[PDB]
Ligand binder design. Structure first.
Ligand code: ZN
Ligand code: ZN
Ligand code: ZN
Length: 178
């Protein structure tokens, strides 16, 4: 097994996957690493098992159809993974915790959002459809773009949103387009 957390790339108290070499801190893994279970399979392994059970799950899909799916166990897991892939980027630190807004010439967003909030919302099963989750994720970056206006810091929103968007297309097998 790896000696660093797959998500944050640090050493510390790690839990090792029993079916791939990845390792995690407890709260970096999503969901948080389970108390017992031996063997333990990480979310990367769980996601690969879904695909292997239903190879056809990788055929192209319309986003509009994906968003209306109910958050049954497999969609819950795919949203958990997609959230994890964002946390995997070091630039997610800017969006993890609750923001605040006091900049001359800007007003804060009406509906603040941040990754730890979405994490909690997933943990507490507050989303009934994939759309719920994806809207809050997109909101995080949109609020950032709107607040930082022409400051070059707005590019952080673009960058992290691109990581989201690519992973959303991958995870939910969205039909490739030109
Ligand atoms: Zn970590
Ligand atoms: Zn694994
Ligand atoms: Zn099948």
């Amino acid at each position: 097994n790896s000696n660093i957390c797959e998500v944050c790339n640090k050493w510390g108290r790690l839990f090792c996957c029993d079916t791939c070499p990845r390792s995690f801190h407890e709260h970096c893994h999503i969901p948080s690493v389970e108390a017992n279970k031996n063997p333990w399979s990480c979310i990367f392994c769980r996601i690969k098992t879904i695909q292997e059970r239903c190879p056809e799950s990788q055929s192209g899909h319309q986003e509009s159809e994906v968003l209306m799916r109910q958050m049954l166990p497999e969609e819950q897991l795919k949203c958990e993974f997609l959230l994890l892939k964002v946390y995997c980027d070091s630039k997610s630190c800017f969006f993890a915790s609750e923001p605040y807004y006091n900049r001359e010439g800007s007003q804060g967003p009406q509906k603040p959002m941040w990754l730890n909030k979405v994490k909690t919302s997933l943990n507490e099963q507050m989303y009934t459809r994939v759309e719920g989750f994806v809207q809050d994720m997109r909101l995080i970056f949109h609020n950032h773009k709107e607040f930082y206006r022409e400051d070059k810091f707005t590019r952080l929103g673009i960058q992290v949103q691109d990581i989201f968007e690519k992973n959303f297309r991958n995870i939910f097998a969205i039909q490739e387009t030109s």
